Write a protein that binds this ligand. Structure first.
Ligand code: HEM
Ligand code: HEM
Ligand SMILES: c1ccc2[nH]nnc2c1
Lengths: 137, 137
C-alpha cells in the first residue's frame, strides 16, 4: 500500500525522482517555463547533468517526508504551509501541483510494479486542497 | 536527536553517503579486500566510478529506512534478516558493519554540527547484535 510505496521510492530515490519528473515535463511541456534551464534537452541529456539529479533527489526527499507524515493520505496543514511559503515556490498555483500528481499516478500505473496508484491519486488531490487552505491560489 | 539526524542526512544524502563511506575506507584500508575495484584510487577517482556512486547511495537510502523503523535505536529483527540474506553480503561478517559505524560516529563528532553521535554509536552496536541473532558470522 501507500506506506510500502514510500519505502519502494526511497530505496532508489535518485532514479525514481528523475524518471517521474521527466514524465511530468514530457506530459505538460508548457510547465517547463518554471524550469527555464532545462529547455532544449532530451531525457538523457538532462540525466547526464549532475545538477538535474541533485535537485530532483532533494525535491523527492521532501515529498516522501510529507507523504510519510500524512494520515490516510491527508497531508498535515503545516507541511502544506511549508510548500506554499518556500521562496522557490513563489507565484506557483495549485494547478502546477495537480499536474505533477496526474503525471506521477500515470507513471506508477505504467510501471508494471505494485504501486497503490489509488492512494497516490488521493494524496495529490488532498495536497491540492491543503495548499489552497494554506494560501496558494 | 536521532530522528532529526535522519532528516539532516536525508536532506544532503548523496554527499553525506560518499563522504562517510570514504571515511570508512580510509580509516580501514584493508576493507578494500571486499571492494577489489576500489584499489589504487583517490577519493575523487572513486566518486567518478558509477558503481561506487551506486552502492553508496543504496547503502545510505536503506540504512536511513532501518534507522527510521527502529525503536530507541534498536532495529527491527526483519530488517536484520534482510541484510544478512542479501546475496551481495555473503562474504561479510559483523566486523565489517562494526567498522562502518565506528567511522560514521567519528565523522559526526568531527563535523561541528549538532548530530547525536551517542545515539548513532548505540544504533551501530544494536544493528551488529541483531545481525548476529539473524545469522551473520
Ligand atoms: C509536493 C511537491 C513538491 C515538493 C516536495 C517540492 C520541493 C522542492 C524542493 C525541496 C526544492 C529545492 C531543491 C534544491 O535544493 O535543489 C524545490 C525547488 C523548486 N520547486 Fe518544488 N516541490 C514540489 C512541487 C513543485 C511544483 C509542482 C513546481 C512547478 C511545476 C515546483 C517548482 C519549483 C521550482 C521552480 C524550484 C526552484 C528550482 C531550483 O531549486 O532552483 N515545485 N521544490
Ligand atoms: C547498514 C549497512 C549497509 C546497508 C544498509 C547496505 C545495503 C546494501 C545495499 C542496498 C546493497 C545493494 C547496492 C547495489 O548493488 O546497488 C548492497 C550491496 C553491497 N554491500 Fe552493502 N549495505 C551495508 C553495509 C555493507 C558493508 C559494511 C559492506 C562491506 C564492508 C558491504 C558490502 C556490500 C557489497 C560488496 C555489496 C555488493 C557490491 C557493491 O555494491 O559494491 N555492505 N549493500
Ligand atoms: C518535480 C516536482 C517538484 C519540483 N520542485 N522543483 N523541481 C521539481 C521537480
Amino acid at each position: 500500500g501507500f506506506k510500502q510505496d514510500i519505502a519502494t521510492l526511497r530505496g532508489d530515490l535518485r532514479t525514481y525522482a528523475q524518471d517521474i519528473f521527466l514524465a511530468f515535463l514530457n506530459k505538460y511541456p508548457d510547465e517547463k517555463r518554471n524550469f527555464k534551464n532545462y529547455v532544449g534537452k532530451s531525457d538523457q541529456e538532462l540525466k547526464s547533468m549532475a545538477k538535474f539529479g541533485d535537485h530532483t533527489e532533494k525535491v523527492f526527499n521532501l515529498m516522501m517526508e510529507v507523504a510519510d507524515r500524512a494520515t490516510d493520505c491527508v497531508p498535515l496543514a503545516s507541511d502544506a504551509s511549508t510548500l506554499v511559503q518556500m521562496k522557490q515556490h513563489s507565484g506557483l498555483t495549485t494547478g502546477n501541483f495537480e499536474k505533477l500528481f496526474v503525471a506521477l499516478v500515470e507513471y506508477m500505473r505504467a510501471s508494471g510494479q505494485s504501486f497503490d496508484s489509488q492512494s497516490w491519486d488521493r494524496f495529490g488531490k488532498n495536497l491540492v486542497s491543503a495548499l489552497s487552505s494554506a494560501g496558494m491560489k
